[PDB]
Design a protein around this ligand. Structure first.
Ligand SMILES: O=c1[nH]c(=O)n([C@@H]2O[C@H](COP(=O)(O)OP(=O)(O)OP(=O)(O)O)[C@@H](O)[C@H]2O)cc1Br
Ligand code: NI
Length: 462
């Protein structure tokens, strides 16, 4: 990804958002009860805690594009993953508007709680004005789609979220880059069935863990990834993807039987316009970050990357014996024998992708289930039933999260949510958590769920 040009809104004629540049995250009742050092992210250019220029720090994620066109390694990788998909028999025919907007059993309805994007968010029009789940009416959508058309700019804004104190100083906030409701609807009409099958089939056929339920899916992973595991963290994955990866995704999409009309929508993702407050700019390469109607494609592209890195680093490596799942940038993969992570990372460097192995370290050793991280979570076999695997969210993260709130009226719900995460760390850990909560009068007034009861309901999921 790389910005091509920037122009002021006055020049382009694009509507300005505002924004309401103030954090909604306030310290919660447990702020000083628990330990942590994460504050709300930097929202405006004038933030007192800034070390650098904010606006230019924001866009330093676009490291540039190295390759524009698939070489022989990328094509072979795209074909293998394409071939592997075929067994899923993905329905390539356009999904109706009604289903794309209001949901099926394997595809969730468009979230009515997010902004509708350009120009709706700028015009005060929100999704509730257009969509109604009770009526399931699409005529008002077709109307607004008629009015504004497709290929609209992505309304871009800073994500109001907790960040490390280092990222606040260095000004590395994260952007929500939201597509226009119009393009969401159209994209989901073209690829809605693909999303459906993917959602319904987390695992090694799809190569995806998108929409999985870590509570149950965790136990399936050791079986789905036998032999020697490998994994790593990407640095700025989304913005580091060059147009080559979108080209390779087009190849994959064509090979599984998509029309050219549907396939031409991928260029609208590769080459994007954005509006950030009162300046508009053009991005070539790079996956738009904000929304989730982009998660599946990221996971697919990652399935291409991993394959393309393997066959380029190791002559005559066997792609039929690779197993992987990806949720965006996050990848868990395995192979019959171990793989040099530092050699992959240098092959990835050729394609403009920053990779550092998930450890210290500076590499794998060899990274198996004990230290294995996926979707932040670790993997812990159940004490009594070792074949059942707990997803372990690190207490470190849970502590950071409890110390802040966006709405003070939501302390009960927010805590329960964290408890549903916490207990997987074990009975000893959970007691220590709940007692620190009950270390304060407000905590003792709360309905904190019982350990063995939580375990009970978990067992009943198997
Ligand atoms: O709303 C959102 N949700 C979301 O999951 N991302 C995801 O974060 C990634 C970029 O964010 P980092 O830079 O904070 O973490 P990294 O690990 O990639 O870099 P470093 O930890 O080495 O600094 C992107 O590749 C997206 O996949 C981005 C946005 Br925006
Ligand atoms: Ni452009």
């Amino acid at each position: 990804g790389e910005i091509q040009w920037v122009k002021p809104n006055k020049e382009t004629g694009r509507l300005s958002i505002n924004g309401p540049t103030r954090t909604k995250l306030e310290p919660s009742v447990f702020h000083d009860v628990f330990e942590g050092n994460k504050e709300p992210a930097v929202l405006h250019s004038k933030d007192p805690r800034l070390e650098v220029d904010f606006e230019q720090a924001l866009f330093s994620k676009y490291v540039g594009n190295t390759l524009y066109e698939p070489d022989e390694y990328i094509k072979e990788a795209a074909l293998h993953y394409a071939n592997q998909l075929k067994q899923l028999e993905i329905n390539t025919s356009q999904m109706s508007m009604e289903e794309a907007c209001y949901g099926t059993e394997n595809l969730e309805a468009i979230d009515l709680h997010t902004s509708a994007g350009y120009p709706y968010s700028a015009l005060g029009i929100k999704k509730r004005d257009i969509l109604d789940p009770t009526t399931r009416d699409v005529s008002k959508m077709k109307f607004y789609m008629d009015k504004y058309g497709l290929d609209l700019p992505y309304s871009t804004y800073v994500k109001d979220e907790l960040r490390s104190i280092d990222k606040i100083k260095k000004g590395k906030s994260r952007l929500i880059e939201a597509s226009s409701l119009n393009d969401s609807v159209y994209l989901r009409m073209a690829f809605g069935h693909l999303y459906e099958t993917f959602h319904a089939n987390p695992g090694t056929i799809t190569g995806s863990a998108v929409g999985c339920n870590p509570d149950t899916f965790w136990s399936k992973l050791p079986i789905l990834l036998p032999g020697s595991l490998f994994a790593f963290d990407y640095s700025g994955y989304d913005a580091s993807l060059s147009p080559v990866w979108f080209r390779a995704l087009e190849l994959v999409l064509r090979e599984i039987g998509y029309s050219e009309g549907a396939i031409s929508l991928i260029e609208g993702i590769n080459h994007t316009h954005h509006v950030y407050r009162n300046k508009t700019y053009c991005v070539l390469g790079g996956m738009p970050s904000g929304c989730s109607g982009t998660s599946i494609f990221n996971s697919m592209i990652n399935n291409i990357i991993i394959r393309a890195l393997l066959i380029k680093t190791f002559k005559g490596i066997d792609l039929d014996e690779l197993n992987m799942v990806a949720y965006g940038d996050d990848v868990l993969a395995s192979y019959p024998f171990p793989i040099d992570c530092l050699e992959l990372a240098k092959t990835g460097k050729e394609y403009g992708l920053t990779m550092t192995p998930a450890d210290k370290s500076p590499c794998f050793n060899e990274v198996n289930w004990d230290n294995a991280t996926f979707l932040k979570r670790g993997f812990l076999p159940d004490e009594q039933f070792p074949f059942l695997i707990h997803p372990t969210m690190p207490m470190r993260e849970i502590h950071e999260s409890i110390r802040w709130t966006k709405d003070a009226r939501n302390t009960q719900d927010h805590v329960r949510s964290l408890c549903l995460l916490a207990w997987h760390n074990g009975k000893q850990e959970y007691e220590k958590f709940v007692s620190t909560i009950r270390s304060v009068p407000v905590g003792r007034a709360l309905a904190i769920p019982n350990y063995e009861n939580l375990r009970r309901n978990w067992l009943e999921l198997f």
